Symmetry: C3
């Protein structure tokens, strides 16, 4: 039993301060979220900040809202050894860079880290699905950290540490072949920095077919938009057709842009939920259910999240300031049907049927289907 009668424009619910930045998490107990099995997290990493490496029981999609940095994402059995510059030496994983507009992927059980190499704050919008095929435990999100001693808030409910602090000193000294002084550091008993630490002194690093697929796609301003309306705005899709790895995690996203008074035509997604996060501006959004009842009718403002349930019809209209968002989909290929427009449910319908449907005349029925010239996004024609 899913309670989708009162959707709400959600704001983060908890905060966790770290040495080099902070972490905000949404209410996983929200009825919409609970029903779809989603979690939202926003990381704000200050310059020279490093988000320690950890892995989760659920696939993640991460949207870079601001800044640029480098990440390290392993991936099981994937040979990735690399030899640094002047090579004494070191062998490491590929150093992957990213910038604003980047939609990064993180498969379940895969550890990763991120570092802000820029001077502005690195803001990351993390979307996790717990009802994903990949997670065999429960609809509850878990992050397993490799270093540090982080206050587990990615889900909350406790002196939580990293995966090593639960192990016996002896055991760890053997496995790694090290002294107890090292087991102390490993366990990070005293680390009071949390999950985003300050990178000390200097950071020089800045250079089975599965092992070859791209782990990101930029759906930002500096890329073509699949749906484009010069006067209205646009939507840039990132599904498995454009990013193969998406078929694996079974997630996808849409980055949308609306100009002043621009409106997204009524529609619903037939095969997935749509966890919308507003990245800029604000808009009036209306969602309706199968009862023909309004389950949401208000404003979504920058920094907020509105979970649009699968099949629920919706309509969006940006404020004078315009509206910009990143919509995560719980399917590798979200299909959106239009109710009004060049290609609509309406257009598909015979005039004879539309007539009897709305007790209108074949002529009025005509103004009904052909009256709308545009497509997905509508240019200020209020």
């Amino acid at each position: 039993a899913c309670r989708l009668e009162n959707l709400r424009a959600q704001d983060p619910v908890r905060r966790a301060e770290a040495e080099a930045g902070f972490t905000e998490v949404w209410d996983q107990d929200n009825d919409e979220f609970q029903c779809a099995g989603v979690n939202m997290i926003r990381h704000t990493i200050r310059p020279k900040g490093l988000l320690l490496p950890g892995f989760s029981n659920a696939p993640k999609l991460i949207f870079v809202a601001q800044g640029f940095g480098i990440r390290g994402i392993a991936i099981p059995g994937c040979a990735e050894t690399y030899q640094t510059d002047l090579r004494f030496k070191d062998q490491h994983q590929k150093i992957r860079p990213f910038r604003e507009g980047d939609l990064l992927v993180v498969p379940a059980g895969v550890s990763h880290w991120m570092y802000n190499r820029g001077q502005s704050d690195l803001v990351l919008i993390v979307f996790a699905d717990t009802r994903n095929v990949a997670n065999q435990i429960d609809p509850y999100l878990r992050k397993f950290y490799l270093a540090g001693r982080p206050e587990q808030v990615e889900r909350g409910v406790e002196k939580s540490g990293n995966i090593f602090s639960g192990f016996a000193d002896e055991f760890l000294e053997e496995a790694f072949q090290i002294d107890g002084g090292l087991v102390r550091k490993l366990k990070g008993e005293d680390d009071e920095r949390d999950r985003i630490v300050q990178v000390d002194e200097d950071f020089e690093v800045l250079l089975e077919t599965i092992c070859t697929l791209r782990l990101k796609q930029n759906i930002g301003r500096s890329e073509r938009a699949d749906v484009f309306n010069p006067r209205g705005g646009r939507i840039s899709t990132a599904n498995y057709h454009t990013l193969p790895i998406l078929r694996q995690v079974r997630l996808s996203a849409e980055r949308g842009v609306l100009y002043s008074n621009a409106m997204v035509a009524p529609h619903y997604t037939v095969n997935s939920h749509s966890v919308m996060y507003a990245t800029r501006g604000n808009a009036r959004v209306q969602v309706v259910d199968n009862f023909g009842q309004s389950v949401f009718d208000g404003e979504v403002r920058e920094g907020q999240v509105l979970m649009i349930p699968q099949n629920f019809v919706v309509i969006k209209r940006a404020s004078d300031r315009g509206f910009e968002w990143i919509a995560f989909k719980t399917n590798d290929n979200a299909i959106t049907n239009l109710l009004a427009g060049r290609v609509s449910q309406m257009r598909m319908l015979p005039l004879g049927v539309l007539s009897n449907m709305y007790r209108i005349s074949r002529e009025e029925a005509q103004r009904l289907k052909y009256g709308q010239q545009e497509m997905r996004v509508l240019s200020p024609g209020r």
Copy 2:
């Protein structure tokens, strides 16, 4: 915890009168149904009747028990524009006709409508699966109508309307580029016809590889039967091998016919449930569980539904009047193992094993496996 100790021959539980016909729905809270995540609906559309277009969160299979008509089933991204006869003009979807014996398909999130073009009553047996991969909400069925103001009984639990009545007048006037008088019709505020309306005056319409697959298969009298016994009756299968689109919705069906005193040999389906709906006559049916206990032993009469749980052994015997049914399967390819017959679990067994199994002799064991000459259906050999 599924309560499958007391199956029952179910009758519809609710009724909804419409202008041009009515709608009956079974008890979705029935223990069998609840466990399998199934819903049953029977539409009775009178001549000149139109079942307004709507879409559901779950895949549907529809069996035409009586009559013939035309449907309009869109399907996302599937170009389907068509230009009517003397073309002023109109562009619409393919006009798909159907007759008795037709097993129609309706993928989740796809809207469709049906119209009775015949003079007899058009009777439709709708089977919906909510525990289908395609539905990401909950095991509760939802139908989203595009026009009218229908009393939501496809699940019941309220002034329920169509998807537009939950939207603001302004919003709808823009999206469609219409006057408020039209928004009034669209919202169908006063429509008191329910879901099956009377087609007014005259109805002339009567003419990505996914977009090319068949959306129906006739498993009626005018088609060969995969399993046939001249003296007993037969069973016509409709799985993904015969109808590709079935692999998508992950449903399939079997239309069966039994002559007087004909019996379907004991058997169980290894990979799915079997939601049997009797279309004619009646029969004595016995189901047994893994405890060797009878979980059903009685009569299934025309118009009733018996949900045979996966792996449950069953036996059927038609009355003197014979027995005819349409069995929906919750898998694209239901596999049925036989207990007695030419190809049986018994036949596969070595006489030495059968002996020790039933403390009988190799000779008696012989009369046990080879004693049954026939196959699936058995001709009156009572």
Copy 3:
């Protein structure tokens, strides 16, 4: 909500004596098991013993811990008729033999039987997954027997019989074309032998592409090991790459061997649970969760089961007597990431990152990643 805070080294919880041996079952209500949807059963079949044929609603993997015998596993629609030796005659299924080290497969809904043809006791470790795609009922295990009258303990909660005892005498006499005296034997009303009966007098039997795939793989001593450490021990994998049929049931296993004081390096499986059953010796095992808390820290002794949750880090160290186990995986291909070793999460990490991670120096960070020479299993380097 999965309770994985207190894993435990489980022992069977119930016993069922049969004529020719006995059956032990683990507590399916155990929190770990319940969360992963697993069941454990151990059959001990004495010489000349036959485990009557039955089928389950869930896929099974069976490990032969001791002895050797022959089985009969049908498989739906798979033509398998075979004509015995001096042929009066008999047509039966393929007679499949097996020995110690054999990991047998039993798809859901498929009946099978086993017979001990050796002189030692035939010990079978049966692993069943109820949360497997193949089972459409509930997370509760069910076995449907064809003969005998077994006390249903494979799940317990009753005069439980075989699938025929729930059917009317008349019905069974027709289906099979037999006398009521035979229906009496079939129903096994008086059979008081339970599920493992004594094979009487003499047992001579001892000779769609799906129908051609292997139904077993030996991961015992007389086979190469994918992971091998001369001084430590090894692990023999059985996934879909080595046994195709595994991709169907979506299960796999690992047979491991540890020499005195040998240790399995820290690690976690990213895509499945690991239901470990100790076949010999004992070891100290430590599991840690995402909170960095120890959710298990003790001894696993021969005959016991420890369910290692997905993503949970673990470490194993054999006693002086060594440790040997069979680990069932709830996925057709369990991927294990290493924390310390030649190919580790550690090795993948840049020295610069490891430094800031454990507030250690680039040199100490060096001894951290390259300090461990070995791989999965570690030779006594305590």
